[PDB]
Design a protein around this motif. Sequence first.
Motif, short mmCIF file in Angstrom:
data_model
loop_
_atom_site.label_atom_id
_atom_site.label_comp_id
_atom_site.label_asym_id
_atom_site.label_seq_id
_atom_site.Cartn_x
_atom_site.Cartn_y
_atom_site.Cartn_z
N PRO A 1 -8.56 -0.31 0.61
CA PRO A 1 -8.60 0.98 1.08
C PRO A 1 -7.29 1.49 1.94
O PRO A 1 -7.04 2.72 2.38
CB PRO A 1 -9.83 0.59 2.23
CG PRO A 1 -9.99 -0.74 2.25
CD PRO A 1 -9.49 -1.36 0.92
N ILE A 2 -6.57 0.36 2.24
CA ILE A 2 -5.31 0.78 3.08
C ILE A 2 -4.36 1.42 2.15
O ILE A 2 -3.91 2.50 2.51
CB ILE A 2 -4.60 -0.58 3.45
CG1 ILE A 2 -5.81 -1.27 4.69
CG2 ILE A 2 -3.40 -0.39 4.00
CD1 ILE A 2 -5.47 -2.67 4.78
N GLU A 3 -4.06 1.16 0.93
CA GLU A 3 -3.49 1.89 -0.09
C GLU A 3 -4.00 3.18 -0.30
O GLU A 3 -3.30 3.99 -0.68
CB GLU A 3 -3.03 0.84 -1.13
CG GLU A 3 -2.23 -0.29 -0.80
CD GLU A 3 -1.38 -0.60 -1.75
OE1 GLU A 3 0.08 -1.14 -1.40
OE2 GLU A 3 -1.56 -0.64 -2.95
N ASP A 4 -5.20 3.27 -0.14
CA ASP A 4 -6.05 4.53 -0.76
C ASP A 4 -5.62 5.60 0.31
O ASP A 4 -5.43 6.85 0.32
CB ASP A 4 -7.47 4.43 -0.86
CG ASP A 4 -7.75 3.68 -2.40
OD1 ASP A 4 -7.09 4.06 -3.32
OD2 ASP A 4 -8.87 2.89 -2.40
N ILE A 5 -5.65 5.07 1.60
CA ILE A 5 -5.24 6.13 2.61
C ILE A 5 -3.73 6.23 2.80
O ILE A 5 -3.42 7.59 2.68
CB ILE A 5 -5.76 5.37 4.03
CG1 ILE A 5 -7.30 5.20 4.10
CG2 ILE A 5 -5.51 6.29 5.17
CD1 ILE A 5 -7.79 4.37 5.22
N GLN A 6 -3.16 5.42 2.56
CA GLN A 6 -1.63 5.79 2.52
C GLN A 6 -1.11 6.49 1.57
O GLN A 6 -0.13 7.27 1.85
CB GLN A 6 -0.78 4.36 2.49
CG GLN A 6 0.59 4.59 2.91
CD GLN A 6 1.77 3.45 2.56
OE1 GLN A 6 1.68 2.78 1.31
NE2 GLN A 6 2.51 2.97 3.45
N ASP A 7 -1.83 6.58 0.48
CA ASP A 7 -1.41 7.40 -0.76
C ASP A 7 -1.90 8.97 -0.30
O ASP A 7 -0.94 9.75 -0.72
CB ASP A 7 -2.54 6.81 -2.09
CG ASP A 7 -2.49 7.78 -2.96
OD1 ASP A 7 -1.75 7.72 -3.91
OD2 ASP A 7 -3.32 8.61 -3.03
N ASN A 8 -2.90 9.25 0.43
CA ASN A 8 -3.33 10.35 0.90
C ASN A 8 -2.24 10.69 2.06
O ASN A 8 -1.76 11.80 1.94
CB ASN A 8 -4.68 10.38 1.54
CG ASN A 8 -5.33 11.46 1.55
OD1 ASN A 8 -4.88 12.56 1.07
ND2 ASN A 8 -6.61 11.67 1.79
N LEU A 9 -1.67 9.86 2.75
CA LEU A 9 -0.68 10.06 3.79
C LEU A 9 0.36 10.53 3.23
O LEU A 9 1.14 11.57 3.71
CB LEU A 9 -0.57 9.05 4.86
CG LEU A 9 -1.80 8.67 5.60
CD1 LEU A 9 -1.80 7.25 6.23
CD2 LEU A 9 -2.16 9.71 6.74
N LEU A 10 1.03 9.88 2.06
CA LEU A 10 2.12 10.10 1.43
C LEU A 10 2.09 11.57 0.89
O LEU A 10 3.05 12.14 0.89
CB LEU A 10 2.15 9.22 0.26
CG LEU A 10 2.85 7.83 0.77
CD1 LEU A 10 2.68 6.63 -0.16
CD2 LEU A 10 4.20 7.92 1.61
N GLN A 11 0.93 11.95 0.50
CA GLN A 11 1.01 13.29 -0.20
C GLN A 11 0.91 14.34 0.53
O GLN A 11 1.41 15.07 0.60
CB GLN A 11 -0.48 13.67 -1.04
CG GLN A 11 -0.61 12.96 -2.39
CD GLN A 11 -2.08 13.02 -2.84
OE1 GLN A 11 -2.70 12.06 -2.98
NE2 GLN A 11 -2.82 14.31 -3.07
#
Lengths: 249, 257
Positions: free
Chosen positions: A186-196
């Motif tokens: 879930p951490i990388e799932d969020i970061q991935d969103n934050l990155l976009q």
Amino acid sequence: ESADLRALAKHLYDSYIKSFPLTKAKARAILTGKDKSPFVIYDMNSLMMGEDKIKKEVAIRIFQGCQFRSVEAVQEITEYAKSIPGFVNLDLNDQVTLLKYGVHEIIYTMLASLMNKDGVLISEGQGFMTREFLKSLRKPFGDFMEPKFEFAVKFNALELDDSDLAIFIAVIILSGDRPGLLNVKPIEDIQDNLLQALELQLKLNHPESSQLFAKLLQKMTDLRQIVTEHVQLLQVIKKTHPLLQEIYK
Amino acid sequence: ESADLRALAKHLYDSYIKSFPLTKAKARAILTGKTTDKSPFVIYDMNSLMMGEDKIKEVAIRIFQGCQFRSVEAVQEITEYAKSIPGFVNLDLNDQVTLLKYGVHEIIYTMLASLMNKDGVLISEGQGFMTREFLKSLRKPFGDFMEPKFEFAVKFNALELDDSDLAIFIAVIILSGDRPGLLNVKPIEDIQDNLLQALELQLKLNHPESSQLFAKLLQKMTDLRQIVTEHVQLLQVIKKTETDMSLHPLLQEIYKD
């Protein structure tokens, strides 16, 4: 939906503004600067006068203050993190873990906002401490600031603003590589969103600045080095009030 | 707005869980027998005390030291929690020291009630349980050192507060404007004002049935103060009877007044 992203960005910005008193625009203005000049601490007398006017050995008190300040910042940052969508839903241990290893990176990120090549704002903008005065301090206290100054000059050349920094900061906090994380996904799932969201933000806010995105992500490298370097200096200071010590641990 | 007060309540509860490894919810689960894996070893006597050491220099003194090292840890946990209280960290650094100095024993005895029933008290992160009667048996002056805490606990546990309530209560205790030697009372009072309001709402929503829980909880602060005073008194006796017992500097710093 670039609109889902646009909402994330705006939210983080608003959270950033609420969480951190002294912002980059505000800091910039005082540096440049727009109202009342900050009190300037350029040597020992100035410091003494400063302190009499405004809020033991000198070198140590300034190094300790830098600690009180970093403790403050930890709480601001910790509050900001709780505004990041998804963050509060992660496993509690992982939130603690994410903060533990991310705060210092964000402290130095944000402290760049308060630095120019000649000094650094202090006391929420009321004072300005010269780079040369800090560099003057007896060892090992002459060096602690200097790698932050060299990072800050490089980092500020990106001319990022508060809205950009809000998102970058959140990206940092959500790093799935931190040691000891129980549930990385879930951490990388969020970061991935934050990155976009960061990527789209910088395309819109600096349309002329080619690969700013990548450049900013490259700076993460500089940040970890700085933190690693600082814990290293810190162990050395461990070679220089019980309850007050507990507060700073 | 209530909504802010709820945000603050959740934040504090969250820090409390993060700052304090043995919550009330866990302690009750160990105490009430919601366990096969969570069961404590029980020390009700010297013999059982010895077996306990197996799976967890006079006894009385030992038991007392352990109690003080645990207290020193709790000081650390509470200090950690304290930094999480919005505004605390921003207050004058000396005031921060003062508030902790006068707050921590009150908080310690608040959180201890969590670990107590009328029969005894959990110890060692809940792996053991030391009966009240055993602690009462100890040679003077130690025999009576826990008893006032039990009496308070029995009374305080009658409120049936849970962790999310204590989180705010504890906060309120720390941010006390009246504490002696405070430099800036105003910024402290403003924070407590908030916390009080957070607390009142929290008790209203969490315990809709419980009439005046808020007042009754606030009144408890009175018995807390008295526990701390008696304890301080008993400590002065013990330091004098036992010239060979060492009291942690932290605790000695705190007891200075």
